[PDB]
Amino acid sequence: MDHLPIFCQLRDRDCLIVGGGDVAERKARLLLEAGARLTVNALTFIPQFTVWANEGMLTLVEGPFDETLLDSCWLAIAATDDDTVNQRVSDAAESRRIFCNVVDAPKAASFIMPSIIDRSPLMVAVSSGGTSPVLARLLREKLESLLPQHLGQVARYAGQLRARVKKQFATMGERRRFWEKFFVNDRLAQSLANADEKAVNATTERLFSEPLDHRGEVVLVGAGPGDAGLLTLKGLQQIQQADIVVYDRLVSDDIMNLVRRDADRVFVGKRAHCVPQEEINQILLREAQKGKRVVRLKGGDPFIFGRGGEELETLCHAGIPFSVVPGITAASGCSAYSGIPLTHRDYAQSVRLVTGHLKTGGELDWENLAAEKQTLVFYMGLNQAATIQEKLIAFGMQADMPVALVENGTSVKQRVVHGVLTQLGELAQQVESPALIIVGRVVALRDKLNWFSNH
Amino acid sequence: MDHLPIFCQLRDRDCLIVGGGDVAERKARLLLEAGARLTVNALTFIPQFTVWANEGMLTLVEGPFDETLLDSCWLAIAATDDDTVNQRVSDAAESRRIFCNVVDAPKAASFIMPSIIDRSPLMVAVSSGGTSPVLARLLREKLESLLPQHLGQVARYAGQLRARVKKQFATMGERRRFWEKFFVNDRLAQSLANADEKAVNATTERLFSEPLDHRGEVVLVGAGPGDAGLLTLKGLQQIQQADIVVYDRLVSDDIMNLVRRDADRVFVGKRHCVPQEEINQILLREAQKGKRVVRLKGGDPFIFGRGGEELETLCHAGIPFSVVPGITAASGCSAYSGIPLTHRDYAQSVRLVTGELDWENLAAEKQTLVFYMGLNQAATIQEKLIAFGMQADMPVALVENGTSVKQRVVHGVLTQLGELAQQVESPALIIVGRVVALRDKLNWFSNH
Numbered sequence A: 001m002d003h004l005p006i007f008c009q010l011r012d013r014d015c016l017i018v019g020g021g022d023v024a025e026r027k028a029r030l031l032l033e034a035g036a037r038l039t040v041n042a043l044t045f046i047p048q049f050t051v052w053a054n055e056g057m058l059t060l061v062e063g064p065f066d067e068t069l070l071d072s073c074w075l076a077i078a079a080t081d082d083d084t085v086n087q088r089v090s091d092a093a094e095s096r097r098i099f100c101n102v103v104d105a106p107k108a109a110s111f112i113m114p115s116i117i118d119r120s121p122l123m124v125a126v127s128s129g130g131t132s133p134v135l136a137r138l139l140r141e142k143l144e145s146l147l148p149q150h151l152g153q154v155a156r157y158a159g160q161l162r163a164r165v166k167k168q169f170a171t172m173g174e175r176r177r178f179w180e181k182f183f184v185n186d187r188l189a190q191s192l193a194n195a196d197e198k199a200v201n202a203t204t205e206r207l208f209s210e211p212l213d214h215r216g217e218v219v220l221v222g223a224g225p226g227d228a229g230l231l232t233l234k235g236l237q238q239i240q241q242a243d244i245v246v247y248d249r250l251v252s253d254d255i256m257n258l259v260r261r262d263a264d265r266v267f268v269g270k271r272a273h274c275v276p277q278e279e280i281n282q283i284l285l286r287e288a289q290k291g292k293r294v295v296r297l298k299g300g301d302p303f304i305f306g307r308g309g310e311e312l313e314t315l316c317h318a319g320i321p322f323s324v325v326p327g328i329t330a331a332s333g334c335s336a337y338s339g340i341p342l343t344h345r346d347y348a349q350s351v352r353l354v355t356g357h358l359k360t361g362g363e364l365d366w367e368n369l370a371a372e373k374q375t376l377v378f379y380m381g382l383n384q385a386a387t388i389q390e391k392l393i394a395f396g397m398q399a400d401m402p403v404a405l406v407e408n409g410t411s412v413k414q415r416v417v418h419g420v421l422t423q424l425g426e427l428a429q430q431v432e433s434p435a436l437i438i439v440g441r442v443v444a445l446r447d448k449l450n451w452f453s454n455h
Numbered sequence B: 001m002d003h004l005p006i007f008c009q010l011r012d013r014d015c016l017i018v019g020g021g022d023v024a025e026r027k028a029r030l031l032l033e034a035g036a037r038l039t040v041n042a043l044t045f046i047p048q049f050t051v052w053a054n055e056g057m058l059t060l061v062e063g064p065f066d067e068t069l070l071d072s073c074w075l076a077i078a079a080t081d082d083d084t085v086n087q088r089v090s091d092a093a094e095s096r097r098i099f100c101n102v103v104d105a106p107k108a109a110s111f112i113m114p115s116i117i118d119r120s121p122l123m124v125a126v127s128s129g130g131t132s133p134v135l136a137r138l139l140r141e142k143l144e145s146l147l148p149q150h151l152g153q154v155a156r157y158a159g160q161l162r163a164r165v166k167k168q169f170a171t172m173g174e175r176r177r178f179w180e181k182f183f184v185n186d187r188l189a190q191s192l193a194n195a196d197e198k199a200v201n202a203t204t205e206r207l208f209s210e211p212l213d214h215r216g217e218v219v220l221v222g223a224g225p226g227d228a229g230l231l232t233l234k235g236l237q238q239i240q241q242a243d244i245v246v247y248d249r250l251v252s253d254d255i256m257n258l259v260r261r262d263a264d265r266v267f268v269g270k271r272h273c274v275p276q277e278e279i280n281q282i283l284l285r286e287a288q289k290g291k292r293v294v295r296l297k298g299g300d301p302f303i304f305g306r307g308g309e310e311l312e313t314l315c316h317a318g319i320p321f322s323v324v325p326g327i328t329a330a331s332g333c334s335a336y337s338g339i340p341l342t343h344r345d346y347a348q349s350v351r352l353v354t355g356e357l358d359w360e361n362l363a364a365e366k367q368t369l370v371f372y373m374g375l376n377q378a379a380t381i382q383e384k385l386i387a388f389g390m391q392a393d394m395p396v397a398l399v400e401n402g403t404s405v406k407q408r409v410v411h412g413v414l415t416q417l418g419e420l421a422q423q424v425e426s427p428a429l430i431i432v433g434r435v436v437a438l439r440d441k442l443n444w445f446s447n448h
C-alpha cells in the first residue's frame, strides 16, 4: 500500500484552490458538492466562477498566489498550468502540514484525487497510484454500471429499521441475511426516491412479513436486439440478482453470459415445440409465490409485440410485486446500426411499427399503410414479403420507393440488403429470421450514414 | 456527497494514534503499511505494539493523553476504550486543523477510515460514513472477487511505459488507442502474472510498432427518457471515456452525472438554440481537432431529434462516426405509466408522431397512437380525431417527466383531452389508444 485512502468531511470547512481555468472548475465543482467552504485564488476566472460567486457559493481572490490564504485551510489544490506556481503552493502547503494535490503531478505532492462513484452516503473511490488514470476511469465505468442509481436511499433508510430487525431476528446470521435482501431491493430504493410513502410502507412491511429466505417478485427485462452492449444498466443489475431467468430464443448468447452464474434458467422458446403463453405466465407467478426473484428476459422490448402485458395482468391478485425494464426495440437497433434514421427532416414524422404474418386473427390494412410519408417498419413480415410488395404498390405506393431488410440487427453477423419496392419479395429471399422490413424514403440516407460492417 | 475521498501519501509524515488495544492495533497496522511515521499514546499496550517498538517501526508514549503530541502530525486517530478521552483527542486535533477519526463514533470528528481492497499500485475504497456498515462490508467482499489478483502488475507496467508511449505517438487519439489495446490484451496480462519477460517484451514491441489512427470521431448516444438506469451499457462507456460531450435539456441531470468528470461539456439549448447548423458545426470542428465527441440526446437519436442531420456531412468530411440507440420516450413513458404499446387484438400498429397531419389515417384503428411534441396543439387533436371517426369514449393519457422521480400521469378520454393537457406541462407525451385502459391492472412505478 503506497497511499492511505481517507474519507474527509468537508461541510463548511476552509479549502483553497489556486487557478481559475477549466481544470480549476472541475475541482471546485467537486469540492462544492462535498460542501466545502471554498476560496479560489487566480489571475483570471472563467464565467462559471463569476456565477457561483454571484450566488454565494464561494469566495474569489483575484491576483497572484497569496500564501496567507492557506493559514486556516484544511485542503489545497494547485490547479494552474504553471509548474513553478504550483510548486510554490505545494511547498507552502507542506510547510504547514496541509494535505495538498497538484493536478498534473499526482505524486509530487500530499494527496491524489481518485475517480469517484457517488451513491451518497455510500461512495467508492479508485486510485493508479499515479500509474494509469485510464485504468482508474475503466474501473469507475464498470463500478457505475454495477451500483444501482438509488443505492444511497436504502443506505440512508437502514437506520430507521435496525431496531425492528434486531427485535425480530435474534441470530447474527439471520440479521445479515436480512440486510443482504434489504440492500438489493431496488423497488424499495426507487419508491424512497419517488417520495411515495405508501409504496415505501408496503414494500417495508413485506420485508418483515415474508419468510426470511423468500424474495418473491417478477421483473420483465428487455434484453435488446442482440448486442450485449445495448442492454440497460438496470437490466444488467436485475439480471445479476435473479434466482431464476425465463428467456426465449431472441435473447442473445452474449446477454445470457451476463446472467448470474447459478440462477436457474428456463428456456421457453421454439426448440429445433411451442411453449404456450399461459404456461409461461403460470411459471412466473408460481415461482414468485415460492419466494424466488424472477426475471423474464425478453428479446428487444417487453411491451412491443412482446406479449409482456399478458405475463403481468396475471399478477395483481396474487400479491406478487412486479416491475418492467424497457429495452432497445428491434426498430431502434436496426435503424441506428444500418444507417437508416426512422425520421429525417422532410421525409418524416409518422413512424409506424407494424406486425406481419405468423401473428393473426383479422387482416391487414393496405391503404392506411400504402399512404404517404410515414416510415414503415414490419416485425415478423418476412413470410409475406411479396404479399406485402403487391398490396402496397396496388394501393398507390410508388414503385421506386426505397426499402431495406435488416437481419440479426446490431449483432456481429448483421446483414443489410436494400433496393426499391418492386424488389421487396426478392430481397427477402436473401435473408432469414429474425429480420425487419423498412419502407420509406429514409432508406436512401444510408449512402451517407452507414457505419457498421455488413455480412 | 457527504464525504470526499482522497488518497494520502504518509511516508515520513507524522501521525498519532491514541489508545493501545485491538481497535488501535488494526489502525496502526494500516498506517505502518502506508509508511507513516507513527507515535502511539496509551495508558496500556498489548504485545504487538511492543513488537513494533523494538523493531524500530514506531514510537510509544506511555501514560495519559498529551495534547502536544499532535503538534507535528498530519492525521490523528482516537481509539481508546474511553469516550471522554477520545473526544479530547478530536477537540485537540480540530484546533490544529488536523483531520481526525474517532473509531467508535463515525458521526464525530473529521474523517472516516474506509474498507480497502488492495491491488497495489491500484486501490479501491468504499464507505457508508457509518450509516450502513453492513452495506460496505458486503460490497468489499464482492469487490475483492471482482478485481483480478494481479491487476496491480498491469497498472504498474502501464506507468513504466508512459514515457515511451508519449515519445512514439504524437496525437491524443493514438495514445488513447494504445491504452485501449493495452488493457484489453489478455496475453500481456497473463504474461505479467507468469513473470515471463520474453512474452511481455514480444507483445509490447508489437503494440509500439502499430499504425494507430489519429483522427477523432462523433458518436450519437441515446440518453433515454430520463431514468439513468435506462442508459445502455455502451452509452455509459461512451460518456465515460469521451473528450467532450454536447447535450441538450432532455438529458436528465442524473445521466449528466455519469459523464467523465474531466471531459468538456457544451449545452446546446434554450440558454436560442445553437440553430442546428451551429450545433452541427461544433461536432465536426471538435472531431477535426482529434477529440472523441459525444452528442448526447434524449430518448433515441434516430426517432426524436435531428440526429440524421448531425451526421449526414461527416462522411464527406472524412470523420468517423457511430450511433448508440436509446430507449424512446414512447417506450419508457408508456411502460413506466403501466401502459403497454401493444396487446393481443388491441394493436398491430404503433404510431409515433410530429397546418396538417393525416387525421383519417391516425384516427382509424386496431392501433396505438403516441404524440411526441403536442401539448399546444392538443385541443385541435381531439377535435380532428373525433371529426375523422374516433369513439369519444376511447381512453387517452398524458405523461409528464416520464421515467423520472418526478413523473406524473393524468388519464381520461378524447373529450377531456384538451383539458387534461392544462393539467400538466413539459416535457410531456400523449398516448391515444385502448391500451391506456389496463393502466391500473399493470401500474407499477408510482402512485404520484
Ligand SMILES: Nc1ncnc2c1ncn2[C@@H]1O[C@H](CSCC[C@H](N)C(=O)O)[C@@H](O)[C@H]1O
Residues within 6 Å of the ligand: A225, A226, A250, A298, A299, A300, A301, A302, A303, A304, A305, A306, A328, A329, A330, A331, A334, A378, A379, A380, A381, A406, A407, A408, A409, A410, A433, A434, A435, A436
Ligand atoms: N436482432 C434483430 N434483428 C432484426 N429483427 C429483429 C431482431 N430481433 C427481433 N427482431 C424482429 O422482432 C420480431 C419478433 S416480435 C418481438 C419484438 C421485440 N419485443 C422488440 O421489441 O424488438 C422478429 O420477427 C423480427 O422481425
